Amino acid sequence: EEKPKGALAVILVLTLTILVFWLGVYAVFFARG
Amino acid sequence: VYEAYPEKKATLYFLVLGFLALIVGSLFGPFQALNYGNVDAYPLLKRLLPFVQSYYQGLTLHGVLNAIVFTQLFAQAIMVYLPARELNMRPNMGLMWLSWWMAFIGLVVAALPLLANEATVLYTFYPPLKGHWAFYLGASVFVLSTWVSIYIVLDLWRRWKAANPGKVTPLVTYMAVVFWLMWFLASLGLVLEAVLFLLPWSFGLVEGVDPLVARTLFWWTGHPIVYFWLLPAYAIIYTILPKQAGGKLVSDPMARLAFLLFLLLSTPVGFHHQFADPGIDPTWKMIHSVLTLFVAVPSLMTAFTVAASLEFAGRLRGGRGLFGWIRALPWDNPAFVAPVLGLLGFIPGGAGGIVNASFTLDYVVHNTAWVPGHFHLQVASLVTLTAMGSLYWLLPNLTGKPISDAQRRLGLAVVWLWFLGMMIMAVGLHWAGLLNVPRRAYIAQVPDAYPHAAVPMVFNVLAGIVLLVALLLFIYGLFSVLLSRERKPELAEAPLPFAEVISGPEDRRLVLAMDRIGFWFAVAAILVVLAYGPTLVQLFGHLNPVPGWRLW
Amino acid sequence: DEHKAHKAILAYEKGWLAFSLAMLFVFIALIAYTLATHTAGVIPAGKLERVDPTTVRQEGPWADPAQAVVQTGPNQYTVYVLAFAFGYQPNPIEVPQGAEIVFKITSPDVIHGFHVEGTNINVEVLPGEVSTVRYTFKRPGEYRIICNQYCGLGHQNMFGTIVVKE
Ligand code: HAS
Ligand code: HEM
Ligand code: CUA
Ligand SMILES: [Cu+]
């Protein structure tokens, strides 16, 4: 058949879970600069 | 099962020994998890095990066993036994047993001082902290054994290549090969650090060692080493898990690519541990930083290859729409569950490491409880769960002693509890780390020092209970799997559940380039000279050896 | 089936990487950025700067705690700190506010860690080498110090105070 969404799904949570974590520490980074 | 796969026997010993170490080491897990909850349960431990002198004797033992000994022994098992089974070849049995003894006699020597409060320096053993001569010599013999594991597997490879002139390296073996090579280049740091320094010192032959060069050489290795811990899981996850999941490994080329990239990018990234070090150029730090983001790539690749396989699996197991396929998988089988929940904890473990990895952003968290929080999702969760939840297909395959219903459900408990229990620790530890609680400290012996972390200290208390239970339920498991006097008239000649690997045309072109293992190994070596070359050469001309100290 | 899913895997495994790479590049672009700005002061100095730990507090800048702080620019003060088995000298370190404080730190025994709770001053201190770092305390008050590299049995109890006067 076709497209692997469950994969795309997972590599989504992942991609957001990255962001939060990163961008998030970037915050605290400046808050402390 | 013995005199036609004595490769089975010798493989089993790397596992058993592997698992002894893990037990003895994890004992301290609870007391430390409780410590980061401001509960001081060390008076107990100390009374229960009378040899323990300090919290830090336990940290040493925890780290040195769970992360140097259990891992290396598990790696050695999977990364020799799996390739040997695919090729259906017996590895050089001398050199296979040499190795084993090399790790045993290694471990016994190293433990002698460790257990005697004579080397309480932690698994990083940073100079000028100066341990007993037998701890350095010990760890040294323990590591060099991996060099025989290299030779042995390179040989299997050579031999298969001889009887298939032209043909492409089969999958599991290609994986195991780039792995051993990558570990060989990686191991050179610590082997050098030993031979040129820690041994000389510890014996008496010199009186000083240079902290910057030592922690530098050392880190050229202790990043690769975590990839060394992971890949044997990664092997299992790509080439065995797909089968038990009900589906197929959906790509051979990505599996190789992903592994290649590890060969390429695992070694030149150690200034990711030295971001807070003096006497190392910002230019070179920022360089290593980027190549560290570059090493996220394989693991990112993997998520999608693996996610794909397990969706496929699902779509076959009788799956459904957006989510359904997850419900569908063999959730009553500890061997599927363990490494899947593993991957689950890996998702956030990875977003720690990218944050970790990124220079300026690393002084938010370096040496806080975040790093333990980070790595526990990596190595104590996934790598360990995979290892754990794999006794259930590998141990029957190594003894011909089948697994019951009682044990299959015992496992399922051990597994689900080791998972959430870790998960919970990882909320606490990440959270305390943000709130600036440091790693490596007996902080429950300063009750008032961190009042503003009351909340996550609950999690850390809770983890330590949950996870104590888990561990004992595990020892219960492991010993039952292995002592029941049951022996099957056939299942030992019922091999590893290797997976069907989707493939076709375009693969040949892409696969062939990757099967150029000499060329990529050479690139890798060159990469390393570039990255550590100018820094090393600079330090070595400007050596500043300081005397040693025992502060325990 | 079967092969209708050996192309279509690769298809979006490409697409994923384009996105993996662009993204990691944005990080690289945002990290690159912090280099250009003030926050970069906390990156140690790259230049080797060797000393002798067995003398360090009995001659040169690390000898007397009452000398730790020297004026060095039009708005700049250098502070020569000492991390040592289970303490920091001076204790407390006294510094002015809103002035570019330039710490020079070393140890006489083992490695310790120098971590100014509330800021990014998170530098590893190493025997024989000198850890140079630059920060400006914009908001005054009492800042605590934690040794966050294990240094022996009194590690849990190794704290300092930074005193930013105004
Ligand atoms: C085995 C253990 C190792 C794993 C591997 C690991 C992964 C990474 N780490 Fe790390 N690490 C760092 C950077 C990384 C990066 C970039 C990665 C990458 O490998 C991350 C890659 C992972 C991903 C990109 C996530 C992929 C997600 C997957 C693959 C899950 C898929 C899930 C599915 C498919 C679900 C399917 C099922 C369903 C039901 C849906 C840095 C900084 O650059 C530090 C320094 C901190 C400091 O200041 O000292 C660090 C600190 C440590 C330490 C402390 C060492 C010490 O004692 O000083 C250890 C032991 C460690 C281990 C490990 N680390 N790390
Ligand atoms: C019983 C489950 C476990 C618990 C409850 C536990 C708990 C902990 C805690 C709280 C720490 C941090 C203590 C500190 O900051 O000094 C720690 C350290 C560590 N743990 Fe675990 N752990 C467990 C299992 C494991 C396993 C299986 C591994 C390896 C595969 C592992 C690897 C490590 C490493 C590498 C450190 C760093 C030690 C150091 O800083 O020298 N842990 N453990
Ligand atoms: Cu000084 Cu820990
Ligand atoms: Cu690393």
Q: Is the same domain home to C80 and C145?
A: yes
- B401, two tokens: 């002693």
Output the domain CATH number for residue C145: 2.60.40.420
Q: How far is A5 from chain C (nearest CA, A)?
A: 10
Residue B158 annotated as catalytic: no
Q: State the Cα angle at B394 between B388 and B396, rounded to 5°.
A: 115
Spell out the alpha helix ranges (H) of B449-516: 454-483, 507-514
Q: Are B305 and B255 in contact (CB under 8 A)?
A: yes
Q: What are phi and psi of B151, to 5 degrees?
A: -55, -55
Q: State the Cα angle at C50 between C46 and C54, rounded to 5°.
A: 140
Say how far apart CA B380 and CA B157 lie, in whole Å: 31
Number of structural domains (chain A) is 1
CA of C39 relative to ligand 1 center, distance in Å:
26
Number of structural domains (chain C) is 2
Distance of CA B155 to the CA centre of its chain: 24
> 3-class SS at B401?
coil
Looking at chain B from residue 419 to 478, which residues have their Cβ under 8 Å from any Cβ of chain C?
436, 438-443, 445-446, 449
Q: Is the same domain home to C55 and C72?
A: yes
Say how far apart CA C113 and CA C149 lie, in whole Å: 5
Q: Is A2 on the interface with C (CB under 8 A)?
A: yes
Question: Tokens 């980074």 map to which residue?
Answer: A29
Output the domain CATH number for residue C35: 1.20.1070.10
Q: What are phi and psi of C69, to 5 degrees?
A: -100, 120
Q: What are phi and psi of C77, to 5 degrees?
A: -130, 130
Q: Is the same domain home to C27 and C61?
A: no
Q: What are phi and psi of C148, to 5 degrees?
A: -115, 10
Output the domain CATH number for residue B530: 1.20.210.10
Residues in chain A with CB shorter than 8 Å from the CB of B315 are 1
Q: Is the same domain home to C127 and C91?
A: yes
The alpha carbons of chain B give a radius of gyration, in whole angstroms, of 23
Say how far apart CA B471 and CA B31 lie, in whole Å: 13
Spell out the alpha helix ranges (H) of B121-170: 133-162
Segments forming the whole domain that contains residue C70: 45-166
Say how far apart CA B373 and CA B70 lie, in whole Å: 20
Q: CB under 6 Å to ligand 2: residues? A: B 26, 29-30, 32-33, 36, 59, 62-63, 66-67, 70, 122-123, 372, 375-376, 379-380, 384, 439-440, 464, 467, 471
**CA-closest candidate to residue B233, choices B185, B302, B169:** B302
Segments forming the whole domain that contains residue B94: 1-552
Q: What are phi and psi of C106, to 5 degrees?
A: -160, 175
Segments forming the whole domain that contains residue A24: 1-33
Q: Is the same domain home to C49 and C9?
A: no
- B60, two tokens: 């040493």
The upper half-sphere exposure of residue B297, i.e. CA atoms within 13 Å in the direction of its Cβ, equals 26
Say how far apart CA C33 and CA C30 lie, in whole Å: 5
Number of structural domains (chain B) is 1
Say how far apart CA B275 and CA B477 lie, in whole Å: 42
Contacting partners of chain A (3+ CB pairs under 8 A): B, C
| Deposited resolution, Å | 2.9
Nearest CA in chain C to B541: C48
**CA-closest candidate to residue C107, choices C131, C75, C79:** C131
